[PDB]
């Protein structure tokens, strides 16, 4: 939901947190299994909410 504004726009709005390059896709790929094995330390989901 970073940009989301259509039609009129002002200033930069390019520099955001979460999704695309860390938290939690792209970059850090040299850590490999750190994307799976740490489970509840690095992965919240689990079902019942937002898959």
């Amino acid at each position: 939901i970073k940009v989301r504004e259509n039609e009129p726009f002002d200033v930069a709005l390019r520099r955001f947190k979460r999704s695309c390059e860390k938290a939690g896709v792209l970059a850090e790929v040299r850590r490999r299994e750190f994307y799976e094995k740490p489970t509840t330390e690095r992965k919240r989901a689990k079902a019942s909410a937002v898959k």
């Binding site: 940009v3 504004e5 989901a45």
Partner: peptide, 16 residues
Amino acid sequence: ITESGKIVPSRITGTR
């Protein structure tokens, strides 16, 4: 999809 029509990555939907 995003406001720009791009496919959202599996981690932001929790999708297998």
